[PDB]
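Lab meeting, item 3. Inverse folding demo.
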């Protein structure tokens, strides 16, 4: 969980460089994001979910402070603000976002579909 976008980028790129065919996942978090609270309580804490994603490759950027660096990263991903979860691949491409709460089964299905 990061609040510094450049630090996040370094960590993500290291993971992608060390294992390029395995993507990472980026969640745009805020203290006020309702779907983030629901995901934490019912979905992203499930062991089946941890196995498909590799939670060592699950990243969160906390944009609550709405700093300029956060606005820029949102723009890079085509968002105005949370919620948003992306599969981010080593070639620079990204999936369509998850835009709200989903249950474990659907979450795994979305991840597997987006390689
Ligand atoms: Zn920094
Ligand atoms: Zn900063
Ligand atoms: Zn900085
Ligand atoms: Zn591999
Ligand atoms: Zn906070
Ligand atoms: Zn926060
Ligand atoms: Zn959220
Ligand atoms: Zn979230």
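The presenter then showed the designed sequence:
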């Amino acid at each position: 969980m990061f609040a510094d976008t450049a630090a996040l980028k370094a960590a993500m790129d290291t993971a992608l460089k060390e294992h390029p065919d395995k993507p990472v996942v980026l969640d745009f978090y805020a203290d006020w994001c309702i779907s983030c609270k629901e995901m934490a309580a019912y979905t992203l804490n499930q062991p089946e979910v941890h196995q498909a994603v590799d939670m060592e490759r699950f990243f969160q950027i906390d944009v609550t402070a709405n700093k300029p660096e956060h606005q820029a990263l949102l723009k890079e991903y085509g968002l105005f603000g949370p919620p948003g979860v992306f599969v981010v691949r080593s070639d620079g491409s990204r999936s369509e976002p998850l835009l709200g709460f989903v249950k474990a089964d659907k979450f795994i299905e979305w991840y597997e579909q987006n390689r």
